[PDB]
C-alpha cells in the first residue's frame, strides 16, 4: 500500500520458486526430517522463563484468572505474529536481515535490531547456564554443600552470616557469587565462576559448530529430556506432604487484579518471550523448509504446546513451593510446642497441634508470671506460601532447599540441574542462530574461512565480554540488563514486522503468495488480526510501558551482611551513571530502526 517501486527483480518470483529448491540443495542447508524442525522450534520457545518467571506472574497477578488474560492476549498477538513470521521466511528464502532488506532496502534496521537484541539476550543467558552447571558439579556427594553451615576458625560456632541467614542463602551469596554490597564496589574475576563460564561457552561451541547439521541431533536430545524430567518431577512432587496445598493457592481467582494496567503489560510481554518473536531466529529456521510446507498448521501446533507447557511447569513448581511451606510451618509449630514443654514440665507427646490454644490458657490459669517470658511465633500458611522470589531465587535458594529434605537428596539435584541445563542449551541454539546468520549477509569475513571459523570467533568474542558477570558485583549487572533490554527491543521490533509486511510488502501480494504454497487463502480471523487488531493491541502494550516506567521508583536489591536488621531486604536506588547503561542496552536496538531509515533516505536524495 505504501508506494515502494522495484519490488520485483529484487525478491524471487512465484513461477521461479518451483525450480529454486532443486538448486539450493547445494550452498544452503536443509532439514533432515519435519520433527527436526518442530523440536528445534519448541526448544527456542520453551526455556528458563516458564520456570521462574511465569508461575510467579500467574499467581502474583491474581492467578487462576491471569490464565484468562494470558490466554486472550495469546490468540491475538502470539498466534498472528508467529504465523506471519513462519510464512515470511519460507517465501523470501533468506535469513532475518535478508528478508527486510529485500522489501524496501532502505528499511534494513529490523535485521540490525534483531542482531543486537539476540547478542544481548544470549550474552547473559550464557551466564545463567554458567551458574546452573556450577550447581551440577557440586552434586554427586551425599551431604550437599548447601545443607549445613561451615565452622569459622576455632570450631566452636558457625560462621556469623550463615547463622543469621539460611545455609542455602549462604551458599549463593558467599560461596558461589562472593557478592559485594553495591554495584559500585567490584573486585577480581573470581576464578571458579570463570572456569564455569569457559565450560558453558565450550559446550555451546560444540553443538552449533557446523550450522544446522549439528544442532539437529542436539535439538533431539536437548528437547525431549527436559520433558521427561519435568514429568518425573510431577509424580514425586504430588506425593510429598504439601502439594495440593500449593496447587490450590496458585489457582485462587482474585478478579480485582484484572483491572490493572500493570497486569496486561507483563501478561503481554511474556507472550513475546514465551515465544521467540522479534528475535530473528524463527525466520532463519523457517527458510530451510520446502516451498509447499504447511506453515499454517505449524504455527498452531507450536503455540498449543507452548500454551500447555506454561501451565504444566507451574503445576510442578508450585507443588514444591507447597511442600516447602508445609515443612517450614511444621518446623515452626514444633518449636512453639517445645517452648512450653521446656517451661511447664509436661510429658513428651503432650500438647500437640490439635491442642495448642487450649493448652496455652491452661498454663496461664495454672500459674501467672511464668507465661510472660515465653516467646511464641505467629507463623501460619499463606505467609509461607507468599514470598515474592523471582528470576534466580526460584532455583537456587527455594527449589534446592526443598530437595535436601527429600529422601534421595543427591539424585533429585542431578536430575533437576541437567533439565535446566537442557532448557538453557536449546534457547542458546536459538540465539546463536540469531547472531551468526545476519553476520554472513553483512559479509564481514571473505567467502573463504568455513562455518567452523565464524562460529568460533563469536563464541570466543562473547566469552571475553562475559567477564563482567564474574566479578564480585556481577549479579547486580545481570539483574540490571535483563528486563529492560528484552522488553523494549522485543516490543518495538515486533511492531514493525507486522507493519512492513501488511503495508509495505502488501497484504494482497502476501495472500496470493501464501495460497501458492498451501492453497486456501487465509480466513477472516487471519485477515482481521493482521490488519487492525494486532497492530492496535501492540500499541497499548507500548503505551503502558511509559506509564509503569515513570512511577515505579527504580531500585535494586543488595545483600550487605554487615548491616543493621540484616536478613529482610534492601533497596538502595541505582547511581546516576547507570542511565548511560540503560540508554545503551534498550535504546540503540530501538533506534537503529529509524536511524538507518533516515540515513538511507538522505544518501540518495
Amino acid at each position: 500500500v505504501l508506494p515502494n517501486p522495484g519490488l520485483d527483480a529484487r525478491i524471487p518470483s512465484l513461477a521461479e520458486l518451483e525450480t529454486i529448491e532443486q538448486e539450493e540443495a547445494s550452498s544452503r542447508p536443509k532439514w533432515d526430517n519435519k520433527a527436526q524442525y518442530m523440536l528445534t522450534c519448541l526448544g527456542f520457545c520453551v526455556g528458563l522463563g516458564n520456570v521462574w518467571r511465569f508461575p510467579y506472574l500467574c499467581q502474583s497477578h491474581g492467578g487462576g484468572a491471569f490464565m484468562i488474560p494470558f490466554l486472550i492476549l495469546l490468540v491475538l498477538e502470539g498466534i498472528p505474529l508467529l504465523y506471519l513470521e513462519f510464512a515470511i521466511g519460507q517465501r523470501l528464502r533468506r535469513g532475518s536481515l535478508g528478508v527486510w532488506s529485500s522489501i524496501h532496502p532502505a528499511l534494513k534496521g529490523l535485521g540490525l535490531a534483531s542482531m543486537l537484541t539476540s547478542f544481548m539476550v544470549g550474552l547473559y543467558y550464557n551466564t545463567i547456564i554458567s551458574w546452573i552447571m556450577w550447581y551440577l558439579f557440586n552434586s554427586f556427594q551425599e551431604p550437599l554443600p548447601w545443607s549445613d553451615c561451615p565452622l569459622n576458625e576455632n570450631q566452636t560456632g558457625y560462621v556469623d552470616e550463615c547463622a543469621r541467614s539460611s545455609p542455602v542463602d549462604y551458599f549463593w551469596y558467599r560461596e558461589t557469587l562472593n557478592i559485594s554490597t553495591s554495584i559500585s564496589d567490584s573486585g577480581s574475576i573470581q576464578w571458579w565462576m570463570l572456569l564455569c563460564l569457559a565450560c558453558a561457552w565450550s559446550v555451546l561451541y560444540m553443538c552449533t559448530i557446523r550450522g544446522i547439521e549439528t544442532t539437529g541431533k542436539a535439538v533431539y536430545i536437548t528437547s525431549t529430556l527436559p520433558y521427561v524430567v519435568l514429568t518425573i518431577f510431577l509424580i514425586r512432587g504430588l506425593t510429598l506432604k504439601g502439594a495440593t496445598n500449593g496447587i490450590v493457592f496458585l489457582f485462587t481467582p482474585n478478579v480485582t487484579e484484572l483491572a490493572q494496567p500493570d497486569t496486561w503489560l507483563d501478561a503481554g510481554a511474556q507472550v513475546f518471550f514465551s515465544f521467540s518473536l522479534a528475535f530473528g531466529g524463527l525466520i532463519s529456521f523457517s527458510s530451510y523448509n520446502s516451498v509447499h510446507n504447511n506453515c499454517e498448521k505449524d504455527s498452531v501446533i507450536v503455540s498449543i504446546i507452548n500454551g500447555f507447557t506454561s501451565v504444566y511447569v507451574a503445576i510442578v513448581v508450585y507443588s514444591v513451593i507447597g511442600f516447602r511451606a508445609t515443612q517450614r510451618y511444621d518446623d515452626c509449630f514444633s518449636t512453639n510446642i517445645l517452648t512450653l514443654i521446656n517451661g511447664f514440665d509436661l510429658p513428651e507427646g503432650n500438647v500437640t497441634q490439635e491442642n495448642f490454644v487450649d493448652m496455652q490458657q491452661r498454663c496461664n490459669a495454672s500459674d501467672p508470671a511464668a507465661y510472660a517470658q515465653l516467646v511464641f511465633q505467629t507463623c501460619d500458611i499463606n505467609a509461607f506460601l507468599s514470598e515474592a522470589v523471582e528470576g534466580t531465587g526460584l532455583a537456587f535458594i527455594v527449589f534446592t532447599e526443598a530437595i535436601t529434605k527429600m529422601p534421595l537428596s543427591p539424585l533429585w539435584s542431578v536430575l533437576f540441574f541437567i533439565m535446566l541445563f537442557c532448557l538453557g542449551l536449546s534457547s542458546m541454539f536459538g540465539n546463536m542462530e540469531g547472531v551468526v546468520v545476519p553476520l554472513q549477509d553483512l559479509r564481514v569475513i571473505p567467502p573463504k574461512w568455513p562455518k567452523e571459523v565464524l562460529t568460533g570467533l563469536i563464541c570466543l568474542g562473547t566469552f571475553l565480554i562475559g567477564f563482567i558477570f564474574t566479578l564480585n558485583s556481577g549479579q547486580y549487572w545481570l539483574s540490571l540488563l535483563d528486563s529492560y533490554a528484552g522488553s523494549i527491543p522485543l516490543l518495538i521490533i515486533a511492531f514493525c514486522e507486522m507493519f512492513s509486511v501488511v503495508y509495505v510488502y502488501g497484504v494482497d501480494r502476501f495472500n496470493k503468495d501464501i495460497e501458492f504454497m498451501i492453497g486456501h487463502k487465509p480466513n477472516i480471523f487471519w485477515q482481521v488480526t493482521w490488519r487492525v487488531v494486532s497492530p492496535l493491541l501492540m500499541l497499548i502494550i507500548f503505551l503502558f510501558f511509559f506509564v509503569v516506567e515513570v512511577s515505579q521508583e527504580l531500585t535494586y536489591s543488595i545483600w550487605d551482611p554487615g548491616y543493621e536488621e540484616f536478613p529482610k531486604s534492601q533497596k538502595i536506588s541505582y547511581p546516576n551513571w547507570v542511565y548511560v547503561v540503560v540508554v545503551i542496552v534498550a535504546g540503540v536496538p530501538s533506534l537503529t530502526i529509524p536511524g538507518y531509515a533516515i540515513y538511507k533516505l538522505i544518501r540518495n536524495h
Binding site: 558439579f137 552434586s139 554427586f140 556427594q141 559448530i209 567452523e452
Partner: peptide, 30 residues
Amino acid sequence: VSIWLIVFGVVMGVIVVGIVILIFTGIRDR
C-alpha cells in the same frame, strides 16, 4: 579432592575431545 573439580575435569575432557573429533570430520568433507 575438592569433588567438584574432578567432575568438571571429566566434563571438560569430553567437551574438548568432541570439539576435536568435530573439526577433523569437517576436513574429511572436502
